[PDB]
Amino acid sequence: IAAQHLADGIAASGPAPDLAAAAAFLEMGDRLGVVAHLDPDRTLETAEVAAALDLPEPALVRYLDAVESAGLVIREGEGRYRACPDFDTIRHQAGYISWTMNANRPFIENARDFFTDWDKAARTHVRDYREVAVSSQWMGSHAFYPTALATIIDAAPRKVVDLGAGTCRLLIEVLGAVPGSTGVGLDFAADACRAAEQAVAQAGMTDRLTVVERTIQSVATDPGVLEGADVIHAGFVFHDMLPEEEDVCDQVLANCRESLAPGGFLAITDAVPYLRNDRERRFSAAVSYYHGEFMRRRLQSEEEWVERLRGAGFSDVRALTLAFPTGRLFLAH
């Protein structure tokens, strides 16, 4: 009678309460630096972490107790905590909410301004690239790193280069899997680079993996970074020079064709626009609208990407569907 109001409410809400909570807790925690210490297989030692993160130990404890109540962490002893068993899936899902609602917040809040004067708006309302890079890492863990990772592990490379590498997770994983390998991760944002270095350091690969703060446009006139490369990867960057710097794009591509050690290949994970299929359409639209309207970057269809890679020297070019909606992996030898 009001028990049916209960059942119908629960069904209408579905998984949104759980996800809303997880996303807020994890973004707050990641900004504090706490989340990097949360793993289902490792312990977080409050005495040490509080001191490393320069937080009052009592404050950290109240946070972790809140997250314990939430069911996201387990208290092992006093000042010892570990993530819940399914933590990595929960964090992955929170990646999508963080990306749309956090990284892209300036577009949500100031749409009026973008509509009436784009140029003034584009330079007034700027995204935090630390947030851009972290949220994409969380999405990538399960939805776009695995395919690219598995492709790269085969043909056991020696040298791997990643353009627009963000927090450098793919390289950390590649280098962890192939025993004797080197990596260089290139990214134009101080905030991302700083975060990448800390993550690389934490993974104890500081000497094998170089973080260089440069544009991808840089590589057009300065391919001194590529050569000797078995694999070159670029994840969601190539679009940041379209449709304006088209010539510079085709120049970076040509440079990649040359610098490649004779066996290897260019791997591009990127986003195609406005898909129609039921599974991808909704998040497709969000990625496409943010890119087209707010960032004025051109997303190319599957067809167009294949054409571009061909008429830039590469042959044997195929495209793969990724779990990430509108995400596609292009392999070009």
Ligand X SMILES: CC(C)CC(=O)C(=O)O
Q: How far is the CB of 248 from ligand SAH (least distance, A)?
A: 10
Residue type, 14: G
Q: For residues 136 and 259, which CB has a smaller minimum distance to ligand X in the complex?
A: 136
Q: How far is CA 30 from CA 12, 24, 25, 90, 169, in A?
A: 30, 10, 9, 14, 16
Q: How far is the CB of 17 from ligand X (least distance, A)?
A: 12
Q: How far is the CB of 41 from ligand X (least distance, A)?
A: 27
**Contact status, residue 148 vs residue 170, Cβ threshold 8 Å:** yes
d(CA 36, CA 199): 9
Q: For residues 79 and 327, which CB has a smaller minimum distance to ligand X in the complex?
A: 327
For ligand X, the binding residues in 111-150 under the rule CB under 6 A are 132, 136
Q: Does 79 bind ligand SAH (CB under 6 A)?
A: no
For ligand SAH, the binding residues in 113-132 under the rule CB under 6 A are 129, 132
Nearest to 214 by CA among 231, 190, 197, 247: 190
How many binding residues for ligand SAH (CB under 6 A)?
A: 20
CA 93 to chain centre: 13
Torsion from C-alpha of 188, 190, 193, 199, nearest 10 degrees: -160
Residue of the chain from 87, 114, 236, 305 that contacts ligand X (CB under 6 A)? 236
96 is in an annotated binding site: no
Q: For residues 104 and 181, which CB has a smaller minimum distance to ligand SAH in the complex?
A: 104
Structure tokens at 219: 């590589």
Binding footprint of ligand X on the chain (CB under 6 A): 132, 136, 236, 271, 287
- Binding-site positions: 14, 18, 59, 136, 145, 187-188, 216, 239-240, 289, 291, 293
